[PDB]
Amino acid sequence: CSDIWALQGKSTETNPLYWLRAMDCADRLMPAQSRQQARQYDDGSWQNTFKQGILLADAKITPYERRQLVARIEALSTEIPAQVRPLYQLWRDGQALQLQLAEERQRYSKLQQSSDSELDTLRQQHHVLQQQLELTTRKLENLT
Amino acid sequence: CSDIWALQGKSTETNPLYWLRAMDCADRLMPAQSRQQARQYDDGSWQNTFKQGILLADAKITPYERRQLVARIEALSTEIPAQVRPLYQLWRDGQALQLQLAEERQRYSKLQQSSDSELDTLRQQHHVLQQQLELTTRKLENLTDIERQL
């Protein structure tokens, strides 16, 4: 695997088996090791953005890190060699769906947060208003 | 693309470029085309069921149906050749995330539905009790002004 990460050249870029082996090899990595190794592949070329993304995707990233990753992955779609596009697309679909799932979960937290607090606020009012009604009914009886 | 689905044998089942091209050819199909082709690969072998999952995954199917497809090929997943395995785990996790997203959208609909209805009953109770309190409060004050002046 050590050599798979090092390989460069038109022969390997355009070969879907090279990229499949890289994705296979990233899986064998402890997530801290994946994150650390991704840091090397930052020359901004499309070959290196794809390697870095492949490594970062096993690295246990925050939703915000994935948002940026999927943005970078999509950016370079016009440079993906034709014969590599199916593999790239399936791997990218995987990152986008994991990104949608973090988003839906965030949507579900905002609903639960806001609806539960407006619920609790209503019950606060249902007690304050209730007490006021009774007190008022009391002053009406103790009218002279 | 039309020939690609017919192929069989060890030289192609162990072949990740074969299955990549098949994943690409599936995209070119419309759902009716997609379901018609899947019907032709039903025997239950892992090749045929991996073929059916690939064709139907994007054929406008239901989550229950998607779950059924994935379980059929998952039950046979120990058989997938070494060279195809990382391609399979890629394709299964895609299907698996789709299943999670449908579960999460249902869970969300539920909470929206249930909190909404609980939010409407309590908001109505709040308005009604407000009007009760306004009426009793103006009555108290009307009677207080009278006694005060008397």
Curated annotation (Swiss-Prot), chain B:
It is found in: Cell outer membrane. It is a lipid-anchor. Disruption phenotype: Mutants are unable to form pedestals. It comes from the Bacteria. Its main location: membrane. GO terms for cellular component: cell outer membrane. Keywords: Cell outer membrane, Lipoprotein, Membrane, Palmitate, Signal. Involved in the regulation of virulence and metabolism in EHEC. Required for pedestal formation in host epithelial cells during infection. Necessary for translocation of effector molecules into host epithelial cells, but is not involved in structural assembly of the type III secretion system (T3SS). This is Quorum-sensing regulator protein G. It comes from Escherichia coli O157:H7. The chain holds residues 56 to 205 of 237 of the full protein.
